[PDB]
């Protein structure tokens, strides 16, 4: 009876590595809840368990509050202090109440609350101790297969979920199968699965390489980037600081044994391993493997790269359904345009001709002088308007007066183009039609017209997604303006 409470507290404390105090607080709350259910009226109840005897006293608790909203569970501070002057706001006033007999009903409630406390203590501390597993490749047994998810049993009453998007496209699991996956998210939700496991995301590839390649686990080789088409093909970029180690050779292993182990775990996914370079152009050449790159042109302003390949290598460089270029672009972070050497030359000739036509038209220069500007690397009116005067003065045949005149013409051309844009929509079209939409300021009307939204009809045809990049336009404000435009155009 008495000594049995101590023996239970000691057994549970030792088996679940849990503070005895946390178990008692929870038993007190469990007994209070079981007591509340025996009364027909909603009462407040405090239970106190004696930590030496295991005896327990039950009260009619009266939450000391400033303003009483529930007279059955709350008491004013003035009324509480009439009984005990030591009471403060948030304390409980008690009332001698018959403690509920510990029947198998209270016993079952106590068991449930202990189990719940262990989930928030023993299991929580187990998840904290397994900080590596929360991120590394956990192993689970398939408990249940649904249409949209797979429930994994990790042991110790821990359940994980693999979502349909988190699976490989050709995997078929059965109840009882063992599955590995990366724990990519832990959610403290009051209902549902708390542990989310992925096999499709790039982290699964990185952690499989960490386990299979000791040199990655020892931080001698670093994985800098990973791009993945799950169950089909992946690319990984590897770097090392040790010049004695080949990072690609280490990840491949003897006759490809290491990369084949990772590929086999991923259902036969093809893995390309590329050397990371700090030069973006050299890194993209490496990422394009196995296609040979003939030349690269880098557009830093658009964050794009034009990749020329031999006509025989074009199909290999693009890959099946563009898979090779897409994985290289995701691995580099650059937009990659793959073309033939002949197509790249034709593109550059068309761009040079368009720049010459633009400069001849807007700068009132001859075609010979426009050609010199393009050969010196000027392609836009903005470059000519804003570039440091020293770079324009390095061009053979430009003097300080001619550079000043060229810059003034470029600025006047940009101002005339901007004004012709403002007149095409913003002085007539977006100053009456698009402006009518309640909320459109003149600045927003010109920002809309710069995207080709010149009329109130053009705005009524937009999605929120088409306007999301306009500086100062929130999704809510975009949605309100589109709805105002639709109300006038379609319902006026």
């Amino acid at each position: 009876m008495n000594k049995e409470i101590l023996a239970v507290v000691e057994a549970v404390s030792n088996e679940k590595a849990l503070p005895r105090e946390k178990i008692f607080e929870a038993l007190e709350s469990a007994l209070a809840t079981a007591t509340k259910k025996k009364y027909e009226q909603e009462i407040d109840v405090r239970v106190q368990i004696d930590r030496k005897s295991g005896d327990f006293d039950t009260f009619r608790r009266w939450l000391v509050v400033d303003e009483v909203t529930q007279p059955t569970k709350e008491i004013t501070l003035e009324a509480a202090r009439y009984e005990d002057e030591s009471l403060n706001l948030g304390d409980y006033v008690e009332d001698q109440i018959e403690s509920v007999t510990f029947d198998r009903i209270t016993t079952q409630t106590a068991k449930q609350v202990i189990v719940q406390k262990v989930r928030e203590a023993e299991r929580a501390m187990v998840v904290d101790q397994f900080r590596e597993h929360e991120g590394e490749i956990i192993t689970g047994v398939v408990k249940k297969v649904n249409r949209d998810n797979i429930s994994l049993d990790l042991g110790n009453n821990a359940e994980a979920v693999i979502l349909r998007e988190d699976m490989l496209p050709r995997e078929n699991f059965r109840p009882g199968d063992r599955v590995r996956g990366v724990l990519y998210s832990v959610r403290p939700e009051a209902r549902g699965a708390q542990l989310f496991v992925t096999r499709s995301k790039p982290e699964m590839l990185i952690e499989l390489f960490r386990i299979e390649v000791p040199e990655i686990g020892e931080e001698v080789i670093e994985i800098k980037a990973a791009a993945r088409d799950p169950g089909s093909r992946a690319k990984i970029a590897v770097k090392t600081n040790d010049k004695r180690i080949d990072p690609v050779g280490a990840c491949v292993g003897m006759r490809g044994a290491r990369v084949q182990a990772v590929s086999t775990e991923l259902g036969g996914e093809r893995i390309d391993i590329v050397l990371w370079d700090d030069n973006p152009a050299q890194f993209v050449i490496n990422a394009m493997a196995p296609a040979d790159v003939a030349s690269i042109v880098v557009d830093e302003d658009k964050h794009t790269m034009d990749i020329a390949v031999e006509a025989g290598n074009l199909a290999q460089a693009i890959g099946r359904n563009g898979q090779n270029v897409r994985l290289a672009s995701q691995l580099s972070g650059w937009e990659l345009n793959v073309m033939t050497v002949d197509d790249l030359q034709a593109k550059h000739q068309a761009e040079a001709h368009a720049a010459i036509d633009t400069f001849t038209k807007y700068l009132d220069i001859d075609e010979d002088f426009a050609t010199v500007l393009v050969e010196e690397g000027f392609s836009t009116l903005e470059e000519l308007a804003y570039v440091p005067m020293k770079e324009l003065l390095e061009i053979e045949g430009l003097d300080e007066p001619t550079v000043e005149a060229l810059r003034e013409r470029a600025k006047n051309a940009l101002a005339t183009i901007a004004q012709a844009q403002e007149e095409s929509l913003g002085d007539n079209k977006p100053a009456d039609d698009l402006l009518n939409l309640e909320g459109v300021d003149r600045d927003l009307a010109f920002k809309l017209a710069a995207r080709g939204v010149c009329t109130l009809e053009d705005l009524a045809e937009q999605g929120i997604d088409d306007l999301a990049d306009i500086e100062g336009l929130t999704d809510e404000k975009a949605g309100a303006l589109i709805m105002a435009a639709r109300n006038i155009c379609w319902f006026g």
Binding site: E4, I5, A11, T101, I114
Partner: protein
Amino acid sequence: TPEEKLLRAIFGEKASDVKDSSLRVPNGVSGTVIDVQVFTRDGVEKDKRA
């Protein structure tokens, strides 16, 4: 069980996994209690309603 050692502690006055049943009576009929008789074998303490 651990819980059952706490079931033996505080209100173990409730035996073990107790379910103390009164004369919890069955169903099928309504009514209105019109008359109550209490007969006491002599020697037994009469309660307050007797």
